[PDB]
Design an enzyme around this catalytic site. Structure first.
Site, PDB file in Angstrom:
ATOM      1  CD  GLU A   1      30.209 -19.101  26.535  1.00  0.00           C
ATOM      2  OE1 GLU A   1      29.433 -19.392  27.480  1.00  0.00           O
ATOM      3  OE2 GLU A   1      30.103 -19.629  25.418  1.00  0.00           O
TER       4      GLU A   1
ATOM      5  CE1 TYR B   1      21.700   5.681   5.580  1.00  0.00           C
ATOM      6  CE2 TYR B   1      20.847   7.860   6.004  1.00  0.00           C
ATOM      7  CZ  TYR B   1      21.859   7.045   5.569  1.00  0.00           C
ATOM      8  OH  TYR B   1      23.034   7.595   5.112  1.00  0.00           O
TER       9      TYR B   1
ATOM     10  CD  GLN C   1      18.022   8.289  11.529  1.00  0.00           C
ATOM     11  OE1 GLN C   1      18.712   7.815  10.628  1.00  0.00           O
ATOM     12  NE2 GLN C   1      17.260   9.362  11.358  1.00  0.00           N
TER      13      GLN C   1
ATOM     14  N   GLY D   1      25.959   9.808  17.189  1.00  0.00           N
ATOM     15  CA  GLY D   1      25.676  10.353  15.881  1.00  0.00           C
ATOM     16  C   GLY D   1      24.323   9.921  15.365  1.00  0.00           C
TER      17      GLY D   1
ATOM     18  CB  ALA E   1      24.873   6.079  11.703  1.00  0.00           C
TER      19      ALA E   1
END
Ligand SMILES: COc1cc(OC)c(Cl)c(-n2c(-c3ccccc3)cc(=O)c(C)c2-c2ccc(F)cc2)c1
Ligand SMILES: Nc1nc2c(ncn2[C@@H]2O[C@H](COP(=O)(O)OP(=O)(O)OP(=O)(O)O)[C@@H](O)[C@H]2O)c(=O)[nH]1
Ligand SMILES: Nc1nc2c(ncn2[C@@H]2O[C@H](COP(=O)(O)OP(=O)(O)O)[C@@H](O)[C@H]2O)c(=O)[nH]1
Ligand SMILES: [Ca+2]
Ligand SMILES: [Ca+2]
Ligand SMILES: [Ca+2]
Ligand SMILES: [Ca+2]
Ligand SMILES: [Mg+2]
Ligand SMILES: [Mg+2]
EC number: 3.6.5.-
Lengths: 418, 439
Positions: free
Chosen positions: B253, B223, B14, B9, B11
């Site tokens: 870990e 953003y 980017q 997507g 988000a």
């Protein structure tokens, strides 16, 4: 002639093991290329105990290096003495263990264990009379913790009549860097109780306080702590590496130190006049395990003095401490403190004293671990990481019970009378 | 020991654009993929090779995949400064987005492209001597970020089984939300993915938005501003895998030390210091100061109050001029403060690591280049506050079945909405059970 096989497992074990070989190579006059450049000849009378002799009068350690991740393996080879080790004795995986005892013991370490035993077997067949094994590792991780006790269990099945020693770093009372250490330690202790003849308990918090309070190292590092351990490891093996009669082999040491088979966990010590040395080594502040000897009683003790000194003064000073603090020595094991002396001192020091004690106060450590372990297991916290590798819950319950039994046993003899 | 990043997507893509830009600056990789300091050409077992593959021509190619159901966002990458860094097959785009609809991203449009995405992922995996797991960047709120990611996670569980999958998710925020149905998409993706992800790091845009305003004096963040800051958290977490060191964590870990129960696998990150260049000037911050900043609620990445909850595990990743002695003292003090409460089933509750490479800032950014920084990943019960807020918004609309027709029109049944919500109800209950003191 009476050869010992050394094994180091995990990031902790390999780091400690590497500086152990730095210390004793220097003590025996071996340089990084494997050639002897020493002064005295006592350096070579018992060199074959820890070193194989190869063509060209070069001495190669009888050491096997193990870890599930290659990182610390590459640091060992780039270190000062990394050139000395037999390159075929590096047995490493790629995945790592992720602080998961089950991964080192059951899945990721299982795929690599046979490759390790193949090196072990090849070394042992080259021994005139194999004596035993010693292992360096931590109980908080996954490789040295989980895979280490797997190697111990496998080795006993091939060499059941041989002595098994370990140098085990225990979790500390207040300092930790891994959340699941109570699980990994409790699972390893269950193994060591059953499959080791002698275990030396080391915790880092005690080492760190020494480095910070006594040696005055303002910003100590694992580098500084490891120098303490390697110095101690040299001291406890002096009687094995140099001519002598007292505790001269692993079995004789075990027979003088272990009155009862499961109570074979020792509190090491190091120091730094003769009266001064003897006072220090007995002090709580010189112990490498976070247990107060004054909170228990000594079942047996072994002291090793190194350097040129008046044995008369030493013998007289050891007796004063025994007769001064009679309350802290079991009355039902007469003459349970044995003293040995070697003329060879360590580097930097002219007189050293190493202390090995089998004290019932060690139960405090096993209680700390049990308390932490139960707090997690009652809620089954973090357990899915272990059951996901195939373990069952009952393997945890048994490990807890055995350690609780081990704590009960230590108390039993702490209160025994004559 | 290799990881594959998947950016899904707008988000996720980017965010990845910012993260990989930061990785190149941390490792000295030029926008054309050349790394002069690398003398092992075409290959190697270097620490940075866990995230970068190599070609005989000396190029360093990210082990990453970018996927979006519309090309507007990824086309910037194909023409941006870092266009040469990625092989064209790594960047995958459809033609019609999911329209803020989970169902379109999962069923209608997603199925059109899922098989191609897995094939390109499989080609990256075949280039591996040993693969640790996947890093999945996405948003809970978008149609593609929620719908397609859930489909990909389910498919990855099949093609690779129990192999690790870690999420970096974007929790919705009204400040920048572009969809009213974001609550529906988040509850549905969380439920669908809940049993496939071993660990999910949520970031609340609102928290980042407030941190950028307050700590970086950014009057109206964008953003770009937010994504750079996320990159620092992602950089710190991956730093232990990309840089060679003795005091590192790996995926296995810190998973094993953060997640006590499979469903309780949602830590909230905290980063420190976040400071502007003006305030950094003639002001250097100590290990203890940044360590204390991690437990202050103002610096959290999800709007919640850890003080009103209990910590179950903390992972402190230090990078830069950090010495073990300082770290031990800082954590020692925390263990004395009673405002910081741990559950009674977690006595040892600190995973610690140090990397010695200092933080890097992209040129033209707002963050000051500091000498030492710390990221803390804490699994606290306070995170359930985030679920409660989003479940309430889900309930308000679902009580009237608002917007549900868009999802039924794409094939879904009302059962999936209650089924998902009941799962969130159980999770909200699980987070209070684990916070109760033991018998
Ligand atoms: C055992 O758990 C630890 C917890 C811890 O911080 C709470 C630290 Cl700093 C250390 N630690 C580390 C280190 C370990 C893992 C990640 C980063 C650094 C390196 C190092 O050289 C030394 C000397 C120590 C150390 C040991 C015993 C002490 F009493 C005090 C400090 C160990
Ligand atoms: N932090 C951050 N959040 C973003 C960014 N872009 C979108 N979001 C958030 O993502 C959510 C909307 O999802 P998008 O990523 O825009 O949509 P998508 O993933 O492309 O899926 P479609 O809507 O079907 O195209 C909102 O909650 C936004 O706040 C970004 O660049 N950075
Ligand atoms: N003395 C010392 N102890 C260490 C070192 N590294 C790790 N440890 C100890 O071992 C624990 C971590 O386990 P680790 O050695 O990583 O286990 P592994 O997974 O088997 O390698 C910690 O609790 C430390 O106390 C080191 O360099 N020196
Ligand atoms: Ca395997
Ligand atoms: Ca075989
Ligand atoms: Ca290379
Ligand atoms: Ca190259
Ligand atoms: Mg979109
Ligand atoms: Mg580590």
């Amino acid at each position: 002639m009476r050869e010992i096989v050394h094994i180091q497992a995990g990031q902790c074990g390999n780091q400690i093991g590497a500086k152990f070989w730095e210390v004793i190579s220097d003590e025996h006059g071996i340089d990084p290329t494997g050639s002897y450049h020493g002064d005295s000849d006592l350096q070579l009378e018992r060199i074959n105990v820890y070193y194989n002799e190869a063509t060209g009068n070069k001495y190669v350690p009888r050491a096997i290096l193990v870890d599930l991740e290659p990182g610390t393996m590459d640091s060992v080879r780039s270190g000062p003495f990394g050139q000395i080790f037999r390159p075929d004795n590096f047995v490493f995986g790629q995945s790592g263990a992720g602080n998961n005892w089950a991964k080192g013991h059951y899945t990721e370490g299982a795929e690599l264990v046979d490759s390790v035993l193949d090196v072990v077997r090849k070394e042992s067949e080259s021994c005139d009379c194999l004596q035993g094994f010693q292992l360096t590792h931590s109980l908080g991780g996954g490789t040295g913790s989980g895979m280490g006790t797997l190697l111990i269990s496998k080795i006993r099945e091939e060499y059941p009549d041989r002595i098994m020693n370990t140098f085990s770093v225990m979790p500390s009372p207040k300092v930790s860097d891994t959340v699941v250490e109570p699980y990994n330690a409790t699972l390893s202790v269950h193994q060591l109780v059953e499959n080791t003849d002698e275990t030396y308990c080391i915790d880092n918090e005690a080492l760190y306080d020494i480095c910070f309070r006594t040696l005055k190292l303002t910003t100590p590092t694992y580098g500084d702590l490891n120098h303490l351990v390697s110095a101690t490891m040299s001291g406890v093996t002096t009687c094995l590496r140099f001519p002598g009669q007292l505790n001269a082999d692993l079995r004789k040491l075990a027979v003088n130190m272990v009155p009862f088979p499961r109570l074979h966990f020792f509190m090491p010590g190091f120091a730094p006049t003769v009266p001064e040395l003897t006072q220090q080594m007995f002090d709580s502040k010189n112990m490498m395990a976070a247990c107060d000897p004054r909170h228990g009683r000594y079942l047996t003790v072994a002291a090793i003095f190194r350097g040129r000194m008046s044995m008369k003064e030493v013998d007289e000073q050891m007796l004063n401490v025994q007769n001064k603090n009679s309350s802290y020595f079991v009355e039902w094991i007469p003459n349970n403190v044995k003293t040995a002396v070697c003329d060879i001192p360590p580097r930097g020091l002219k007189m050293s004293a190493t202390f090995i004690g089998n004290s019932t106060a060690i139960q405090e450590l096993f209680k700390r671990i049990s308390e932490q372990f139960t707090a997690m297991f009652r809620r089954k916290a973090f357990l899915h990481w272990y059951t996901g590798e195939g373990m069952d819950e009952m393997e945890f319950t048994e490990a807890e019970s055995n350690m609780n039994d081990l704590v009960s046993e230590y108390q039993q003899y702490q209160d025994a009378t004559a | 020991r290799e990881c594959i990043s998947i950016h899904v997507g707008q988000a996720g893509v980017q965010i990845g654009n910012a993260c990989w830009e930061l990785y190149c600056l941390e490792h000295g990789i030029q926008p054309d993929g050349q790394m002069p300091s690398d003398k092992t050409i075409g290959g190697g077992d270097d620490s940075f090779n866990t995230f970068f593959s190599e070609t005989g021509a000396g190029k360093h190619v990210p082990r990453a995949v970018f996927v979006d159901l519309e090309p507007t966002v990824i086309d910037e990458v194909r023409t941006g400064t870092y266009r040469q860094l990625f092989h064209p097959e790594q960047l995958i785009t459809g033609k019609e987005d999911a329209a803020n609809n989970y169902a379109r991203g999962h069923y209608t449009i997603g199925k059109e492209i899922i098989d191609l995405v897995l094939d390109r992922i499989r080609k990256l995996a075949d280039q591996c001597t040993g693969l640790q797991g996947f890093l999945v960047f996405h948003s809970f709120g978008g149609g593609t970020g929620s719908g397609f990611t859930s489909l990909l996670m389910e498919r990855l569980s099949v093609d690779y089984g129990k192999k690790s999958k870690l999420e970096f998710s974007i929790y919705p925020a009204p400040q920048v939300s572009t969809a009213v149905v974001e609550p529906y998409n988040s509850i549905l993706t969380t439920h669908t993915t809940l049993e496939h992800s071993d660990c999910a790091f949520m970031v609340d845009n609102e928290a980042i938005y407030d941190i950028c305003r307050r700590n970086l004096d950014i009057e109206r963040p964008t953003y770009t501003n937010l994504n750079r800051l996320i990159s620092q958290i992602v950089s710190s977490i991956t730093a232990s895998l990309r840089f060679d060191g003795a005091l590192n964590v790996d995926l296995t870990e810190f998973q094993t030390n953060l997640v006590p129960y499979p469903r309780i696998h949602f830590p909230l990150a905290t980063y420190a210091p976040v400071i502007s260049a003006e305030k950094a000037y003639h002001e250097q911050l100590s290990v203890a100061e940044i360590t204390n900043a991690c437990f202050e609620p103002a610096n959290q990445m999800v709007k919640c109050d850890p003080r009103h909850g209990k910590y179950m595990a903390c992972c402190l990743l230090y990078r830069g001029d950090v010495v073990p002695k300082d770290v031990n003292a800082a954590i020692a003090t925390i263990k004395t403060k009673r405002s910081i409460q741990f559950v009674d089933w977690c006595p040892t509750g600190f995973k610690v690591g140090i990397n010695y490479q200092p933080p890097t800032v992209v040129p033209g950014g707002d963050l000051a280049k500091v000498q030492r920084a710390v990221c803390m990943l804490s699994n606290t019960t306070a995170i359930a506050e985030a679920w409660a807020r989003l479940d309430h918004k889900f309930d308000l609309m679902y009580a009237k079945r608002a917007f549900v027709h868009w999802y039924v029109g794409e094939g879904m049944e009302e059962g999936e909405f209650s089924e998902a919500r009941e799962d969130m109800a159980a999770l909200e209950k699980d987070y209070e059970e684990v916070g109760v003191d033991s018998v």
